[PDB]
Curated annotation (Swiss-Prot), chain C:
Protein localization: Nucleus
Something else known: Present with 1730 molecules/cell in log phase SD medium.
HAT-type repeats, residues: 7-39, 51-83, 85-118
Species: Saccharomyces cerevisiae (strain ATCC 204508 / S288c)
Role, per record: Essential component of the U1 snRNP particle, which recognizes and binds the 5'-splice site of pre-mRNA. Together with other non-snRNP factors, U1 snRNP forms the spliceosomal commitment complex, that targets pre-mRNA to the splicing pathway. U1 snRNP is cotranscriptionally recruited to intron-containing genes. Required for U1 snRNP biogenesis.
Gene: PRP42
Name listed for the protein in its UniProt record: U1 small nuclear ribonucleoprotein component PRP42
Assembly behavior: Component of the 18S U1 snRNP particle, a subcomplex of the spliceosome.
UniProtKB/Swiss-Prot annotation, chain E:
Entry's localization field: Nucleus
Record-given protein name: U1 small nuclear ribonucleoprotein 70 kDa homolog
Other notes: Present with 736 molecules/cell in log phase SD medium.
Role: Involved in nuclear mRNA splicing.
Superkingdom, taxonomy of origin: Eukaryota
Subunit field text: Component of the spliceosome, where it is associated with snRNP U1. Binds stem loop I of U1 snRNA. Interacts with mRNA.
From Swiss-Prot, chain H:
SUPFAM superfamilies documented for this protein: Sm-like ribonucleoproteins
Record's keyword annotation contains RNA-binding: yes
One GO BP annotation of this record: 7-methylguanosine cap hypermethylation
Compartmental location: Nucleus; Cytoplasm
Gene: SMX2
Domain (Sm) ranges: 1-72
Listed Pfam families: LSM
Gene Ontology cellular component list: catalytic step 2 spliceosome; commitment complex; cytoplasm; nucleus; precatalytic spliceosome; SMN-Sm protein complex; spliceosomal complex; spliceosomal tri-snRNP complex
Organism: Saccharomyces cerevisiae (strain ATCC 204508 / S288c) (Baker's yeast)
Oligomeric and partner information: Component of the Sm core complex, present in spliceosomal snRNP U1, U2, U4/U6 and U5. The core complex contains SMB1, SMD1, SMD2, SMD3, SME1, SMX3 and SMX2 (Sm proteins B, D1, D2, D3, E, F and G, respectively), and is probably a heptameric ring structure. SMX2 specifically interacts with SME1.
Top-level taxonomy: Eukaryota, Fungi, Dikarya, Ascomycota, Saccharomycotina
Name of the protein described by the UniProt record: Small nuclear ribonucleoprotein G
Keyword Cytoplasm assigned: yes
Gene Ontology MF terms in the entry: RNA binding
From Swiss-Prot, chain M:
Intrachain S-S bonds: none
Gene Ontology cellular component list: catalytic step 2 spliceosome; commitment complex; cytoplasm; nucleus; pICln-Sm protein complex; Prp19 complex; spliceosomal complex; U1 snRNP
Annotated organism of origin: Saccharomyces cerevisiae (strain ATCC 204508 / S288c) (Baker's yeast)
Quaternary structure and interacting proteins, as annotated: Component of the Sm core complex, present in spliceosomal snRNP U1, U2, U4/U6 and U5. The core complex contains SMB1, SMD1, SMD2, SMD3, SME1, SMX3 and SMX2 (Sm proteins B, D1, D2, D3, E, F and G, respectively), and is probably a heptameric ring structure. SMX3 specifically interacts with SME1.
Keywords carried by this UniProt record: Cytoplasm, mRNA processing, mRNA splicing, Nucleus, Ribonucleoprotein, RNA-binding, Spliceosome
Domain of life: Eukaryota
Record localization: Nucleus; Cytoplasm
Family affiliation: Belongs to the snRNP Sm proteins family. SmF/LSm6 subfamily.
Gene Ontology terms: biological process: 7-methylguanosine cap hypermethylation; mRNA 5'-splice site recognition; mRNA splicing, via spliceosome; spliceosomal complex assembly; spliceosomal snRNP assembly; U2-type prespliceosome assembly
Keyword Ribonucleoprotein attributed: yes
Function: Plays a role in pre-mRNA splicing as a core component of the spliceosomal U1, U2, U4 and U5 small nuclear ribonucleoproteins (snRNPs), the building blocks of the spliceosome.
More info: Present with 2570 molecules/cell in log phase SD medium.
Taxonomy of the source species: Eukaryota, Fungi, Dikarya, Ascomycota, Saccharomycotina
Protein name per UniProt: Small nuclear ribonucleoprotein F
Amino acid sequence: MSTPAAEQRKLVEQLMGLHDPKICKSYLVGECPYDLFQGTKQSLGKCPQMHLTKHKIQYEREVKQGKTFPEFEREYLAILSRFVNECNGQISVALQNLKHTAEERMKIQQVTEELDVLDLISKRKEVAKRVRNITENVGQSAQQKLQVCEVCGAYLSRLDTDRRLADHFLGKIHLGYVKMREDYDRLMKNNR
Amino acid sequence: SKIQVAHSSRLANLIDYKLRVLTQDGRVYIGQLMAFDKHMNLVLNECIEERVPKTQLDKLRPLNIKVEKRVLGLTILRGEQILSTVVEDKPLLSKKERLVRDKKEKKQAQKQTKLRKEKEK
Amino acid sequence: MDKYTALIHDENFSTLTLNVSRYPKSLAYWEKLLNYIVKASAPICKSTEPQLLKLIRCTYSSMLNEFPYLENYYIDFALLEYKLGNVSMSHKIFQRGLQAFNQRSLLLWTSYLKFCNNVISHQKQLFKKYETAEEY
Amino acid sequence: KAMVPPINCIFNFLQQQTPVTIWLFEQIGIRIKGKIVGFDEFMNVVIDEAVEIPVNKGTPLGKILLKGDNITLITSA
Amino acid sequence: MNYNLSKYPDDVSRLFKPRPPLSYKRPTDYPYAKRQTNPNITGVANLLST
Amino acid sequence: MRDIVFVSPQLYLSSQEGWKSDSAKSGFIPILKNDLQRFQDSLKHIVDARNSSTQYKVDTNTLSDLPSDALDQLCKDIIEFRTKVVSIEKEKKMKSTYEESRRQR
Amino acid sequence: FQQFQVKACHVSKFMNELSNFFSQVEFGKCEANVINYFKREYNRTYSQI
Amino acid sequence: VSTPELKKYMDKKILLNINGSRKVAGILRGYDIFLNVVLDDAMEINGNNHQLGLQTVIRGNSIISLEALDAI
Amino acid sequence: MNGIPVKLLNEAQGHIVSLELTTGATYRGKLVESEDSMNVQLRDVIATEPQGAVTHMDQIFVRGSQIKFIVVPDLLKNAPLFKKNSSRPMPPI
Amino acid sequence: RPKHELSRAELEELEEFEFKHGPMSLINDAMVTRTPVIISLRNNHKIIARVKAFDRHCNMVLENVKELWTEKKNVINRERFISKLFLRGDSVIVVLKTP
Amino acid sequence: RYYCEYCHSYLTHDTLSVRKSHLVGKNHLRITADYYRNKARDIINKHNHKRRHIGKRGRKERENSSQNETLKVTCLSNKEKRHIMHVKKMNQKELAQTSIDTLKLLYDGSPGYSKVFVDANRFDIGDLVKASKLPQRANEKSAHHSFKQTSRSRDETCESNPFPRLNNPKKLEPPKILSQWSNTIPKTSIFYSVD
Amino acid sequence: MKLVNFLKKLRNEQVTIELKNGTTVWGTLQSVSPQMNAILTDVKLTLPQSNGIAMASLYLTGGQQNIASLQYINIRGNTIRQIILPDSLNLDSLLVDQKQLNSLRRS
Amino acid sequence: PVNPKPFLKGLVNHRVGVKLKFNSTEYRGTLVSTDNYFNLQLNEAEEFVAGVSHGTLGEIFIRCNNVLYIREL
RNA sequence: UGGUAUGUUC
RNA sequence: AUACUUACCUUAAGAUAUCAGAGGAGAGUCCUACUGAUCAAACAUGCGCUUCCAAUAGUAGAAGGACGUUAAGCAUUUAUCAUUGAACUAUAAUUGUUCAUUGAAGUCAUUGAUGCAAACUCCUUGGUCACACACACAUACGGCGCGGAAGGCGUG
């Protein structure tokens, strides 16, 4: 807001049994996927369930000493499994797009025309033709030079240095998705 | 000081005048204003801050007064701890020369927009 | 435990301290011991232990009283005291450094005046100090 | 560990119900001791079992809605 | 004054040699420990009586 | 200061008073209190002669965040490992399909 | 402090030279406990030598 | 409106000054858009020492500045 | 919205400035990052208390309401914020 | 209810409703029954006057002002009669109405 | 909304994370540095001359001044004054950019060279050097330079390099002289110097 | 219902202003901001029977030669304690509140 | 658990006391009405200068600028 | 329906 | 410069001077190249209006300073506390006197700080302008030259 007093009033009004559908169980356990992708380009919109800080503090005080609720944990596990399946489908679509870009029609035609002319002295000529074909393949792959991120499914680069890569890893999408992968691996280690 | 400050002028019209602005302490800042805002935050070019000592205050209470002057240069003063502002000294160039300078600035800005339109094409 | 208690009970610190106090006029031993004490405090700030800062000050004072002709180490300990917050002790270190050469060392005057260009808050005193450096 | 905002700090301070030392303005102001029961967005803090001690013989005060513009510092005694 | 953190080159920094530090003098007002309005304001019941 | 003792060999080898102290006197070397016997046993002969992955190199990530700097190195090491593995798989497949095509043609 | 030397004089020459020295020099604004400061510095310097 | 940039003071010891002398040295645990400062293990420093509980919260109106006592 | 003086205070980031506080303490140091609320952070800070003494802080952060003034360097005498008739090259839709 | 989410351009009606049935019942009673009130200010300037207008900032127009303060050296009371006054609500400590 | 007066670029609603990232990028740095350099050059190069005030001079001053002598005015052509003023401008900028660096290379073998003169193990301003490294997120900026760093650590002691003359030093630079007044040097030296 | 619009109808009115520092300012009003930043001309200001800060603020404004005569003074809103209007002006016609009348007619 | 607005709406019609910032003005009376800016309206209030009384006042309007706290007896 | 900044190839 | 990846973000609203009357649109609201009045802005324009604009028939002087000198000028005022030892005035956390061990910070400044007072030098500004080196005035002063700078009032 334009005044900070209305912001503090909003914080008070959103800060002040428990098994109700209005409480977001993924936020009640922690790290809701609709919260970790709020304003980025991969946004899901808005969470339909409400988020609260007093219920989160009560859940933390209950999980500290009192007890734990497996139903909200199972719902968060199902939501994390559905989001991980959607992200794995997006990563498979990105891998299929990369394989289609590596296997284009004109690129395969140029590679076949280079390999058709690739065939002591004959072995040295074949080695030179294979080196020229490898240089042509490296020049064709260097037109994009886009790898696949093994975790978040984005695009990376091999010739890029570690500082721009470290700038890439410190985003909202990557931190949220690594936290979701850690939660999914913890729940699969607890369940199995 | 026979300056004859304008009778119907405001802060948009008092710009580039050598102000003598008073604060709550009395730490008087002398300098040219170049900008303001809604909270009356004043930038001050070639500014000097003058005060009176505690020993001089007895002589000031009912002559020469030795004020303490420090040089601030180009400062930017807030509008919270200020009390009043007056116009002390007129600027160097006149109103007609500022009008010719503003017409040259408008023609230069129009030429710059024509250069941006030529570079955009 | 803090870094000071781990600095006491460390095996290397006692050996370096005994090699310093065994041959006091071996300057390489003093510099290795000083670098080990500075390495023991990898953050250098005002929030560290004063029981270790007093030991750093005693080590620098012993090194500058044993070797008063070291030009750079008066600058080093003076800017260390300037890093630790105060400037009166740094001015005392500069004054005893300029007295160690009896007011005729160019590097200490240069570093003290580059220091005094920010910390004097007075113009006539800066002019009297620069004229003293001019006449000496 | 993590970040603890001041509104959630006062909220946990309200849940725990520790003994409270609330400071105020300077030498005219008087340090109060009590227990927090309510607050709001303008930091108008409601306290109970209040004993006031001046700056260096306490008197009971009851229940107090202390306003925001004089509150300086809150500690857990 | 010699070495900077600044992203600008040295040719900009020689143009950005700042002003000399300000000559400090003794303050004139009361410090903020003593900054307050008037105490012992009497009640308005004497005006309603006489 | 506790657990310290100030001593100089210039006043001990000359056999003078005030050669040791516990307080900060100008010109004395501070040694440990339990090692003063090791100091006295060291200068015995002088007194006797007197009497007679390739991630996070801490050079690029210096102006970055100091908070999440542990997982950031791990992610970089994972990405480098993945880039190495994808290169190795490509090099293995390049000498397999083309070798089979050379055996077919 | 500044050290001042007199050498090889009679009584009247000592009187005239000390009076001609103190008639030209101008003192002023000495520190209060500068005597103990000179004592500590003198003892420190000669303990060093 | 704007959140103040106290991110570099996340796990470092700071020293608030209150109004001309009350130097509260603590460890910054959190802040708001109002410069209200949460300090763990507070300590009052006088020119003597006084302890101020385990946790504390300090109003941003009386806060003037703060010295970063720990290195960054 | 914001205004010219807060844009000028955000302009001189990374430069040696000198603050004066409401108590009388004058700070001087390199501005780290200024904000719209003028809660400004300085580095290599030299401080003068109203009692008179001089000390040195490493990393200060002062709140905007307790500032008397701040001195920017003189090369910001000529700034495009000071231009009265600077036109605007086609703002986006 | 939050202030920003009430409505648009109908906040003046709620301000008048708070004026009629809130803490403003004494400033409303003084301006319609022309009774003199005693306003004590933040610098011992006690004002006996009648209220002419009301403001959200408690900026009050006062007619036939009889003001009084006390100089403490020794103890004297100095008064002044001012015909028209526009008092700011910053200076106002308290407002007392006589029956 | 936000508008950069330097880069002449607009922005979305005013986010501090976007505005902070705008003042770090290289295009804003180039435009800002060039604008500050050109405004400083304009306020130096602006020859604000005084408005002349000519009065009706005295009679005896006219009989004294018009009889003493008549001086000769020197003047040059266009390319000559252009070349001379260009040489004077490059001399003024190379004097404004230079500084004496004799104490850095004259105490190079000093035992405290790694604690003061290295400018990275300095106490008060060394954290400023260690903070902004300009971390070179471009791979070409790190792959361009292939020389050694020669970073002298603080822990270098007096045991390393004991004899400064055996480890080959450099002969010090001669006192540089003005090239316009170089023809008046004593052509005969005092002693015979070989090589 | 802000009464600064009442002072906006008070142009060319020869008033006095007592400030919070204690200074009485006799002068004619020219204009007033809606934030009550009022400009005045043909001004004499006086600190009555003291406050040394107010005496410093009185003298250090140029034009002292303790009545100080100044040509043009702008006064900030928070420094205004009270303003005394001339008794010859009719308050029943200047406080008509035409904005409040339009707001009542809009209801 | 509680908030100042329901506690202050329930504080109406009670002998309450209000201390000011000046430690010489304390008004003890019956609360009538209170707005959202927490202005106070009291009836049959009593002045308390440093503890001792001076006289009864009546219907009075205490501004929220100069209050320090309000208490319930 | 977009903007700012950065890294590769032509 | 094109092509692509990544990091952040994707917007508080309403309106453009006021009053009175007439007409139109299905008590309330909107419009009129509709009419009268006030106010604001811009451009011109005039008021025997208000203030200022530096010798040259000399080697000066007006305004603002020196973060300039004499000037370390002259007259005053301060330059840390506590425990104990050898004496001690003594209501104090031995305060006071002489000497010291130790303990926490410990502005530099005493050529310092405040007040007083004169002389010299140097910086920025101007109409350094047109005629003449001249006998006017109680209705106190022929303001009846070409302009410039600041302002007031009046008209289109």
